[PDB]
Design a protein around this ligand. Structure first.
Ligand code: SLB
Length: 307
């Protein structure tokens, strides 16, 4: 009657987040549908490290499940930065097809398993990133000199650089206190994350910059997964796909309602003209291609071929 597999799921997201809620549904489904044989415990709030660290732990066996964006694999395969080049992926359906229907995406999935020890269970939408700050962003000119926190990720650094801001990389866990103490001026994250982390308590302004679309991959250690029998492998996979659908809904539904939530909290929302933002990224696309060469040019081609 005790569990036969005691598995662990680590995440940066906190206990108020859509990601945690969907992870909870995943653990419930797996426990139910395995008839008790699998129990998944959750380790949120970066208590095990950030997402780079948890990825390594899945490879080493010490952690069984985690989340990652397609774009995070730019750390290992630099052309994979295409997923997060600002304004390139314009909606979630493209993000699905970029990963699953392109030669490059399909090859990335195989390398994740053979080289990184990761098996992909499902993909979700994790929102489109927006920009909060302690002063109004009425146009790109207001970004100049803004001390903008970004995650430890080259594409986020590059958004900040190319719009004129002063980037400050730092881990997710440290942002609330950095905004509270105004050691940084702003940050950038999907709207649902601004809510979950209560960044609206320490940011008076929100700008709809739509600059980077985030997905979320449900990952399992390939070692852990291969040790499960085939019928429990199917359980885990079906549970991951159900959870991912719920995960996407949480974020889609929130993007219809969260701007007015923040206005009720007294945040001032702006909708700057995005053509100068998009223009400001054209040099960055040029530099991506210079750095990644033939490979980067081909992934950009495969992604443009998606309607
Ligand atoms: C799966 C995951 O860990 N996502 C985290 C991402 C990625 O680390 C980053 O976008 C680079 O891929 O950054 C955050 O948005 C952030 O620190 O602001 C928190 C979010 O939980």
């Amino acid at each position: 009657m005790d569990a036969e597999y005691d598995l662990k799921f680590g995440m940066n997201a906190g206990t108020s987040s859509n990601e945690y809620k969907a992870a909870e549904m995943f653990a419930k489904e797996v426990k139910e549908k395995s008839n008790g044989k699998i129990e998944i415990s959750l380790y949120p709030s970066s208590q095990l490290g950030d997402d780079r660290a948890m990825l390594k732990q899945l490879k080493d066996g010490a952690l069984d499940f985690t989340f990652a964006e397609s774009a995070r694999f730019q750390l290992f395969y630099p052309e994979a930065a295409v997923f997060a080049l600002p304004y390139v992926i314009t909606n979630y359906e493209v993000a699905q097809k970029a990963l699953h229907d392109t030669a490059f995406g399909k090859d990335l999935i195989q390398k994740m398993n053979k080289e990184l020890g990761l098996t992909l269970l499902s993909q979700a939408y994790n929102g489109t990133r927006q920009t909060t700050s302690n002063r109004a962003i009425n146009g790109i000119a207001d970004m100049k000199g803004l001390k903008l926190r970004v995650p430890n990720a080259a594409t986020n650094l590059a958004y900040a650089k190319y719009v004129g801001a002063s980037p400050t990389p730092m881990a997710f866990s440290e942002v609330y206190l950095a905004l509270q103490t105004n050691s940084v001026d702003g940050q950038e994250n999907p709207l649902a994350t601004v809510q979950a982390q209560k960044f609206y308590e320490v940011q008076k302004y929100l700008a709809i910059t739509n600059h980077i679309l985030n997905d979320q991959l449900y990952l399992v250690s390939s070692e852990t997964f291969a040790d499960l029998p085939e019928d429990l492998q199917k359980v885990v996979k079906k549970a991951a796909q159900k959870a991912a659908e719920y995960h996407t809904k949480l974020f889609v539904d929130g993007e219809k309602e969260l701007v007015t939530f923040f206005e009720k909290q007294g945040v001032t929302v702006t909708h700057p003209d995005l053509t100068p933002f998009k223009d400001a990224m054209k040099p960055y696309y040029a530099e991506f291609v210079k750095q990644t060469g033939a490979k980067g040019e081909e992934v950009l081609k495969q992604i443009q071929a998606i309607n």
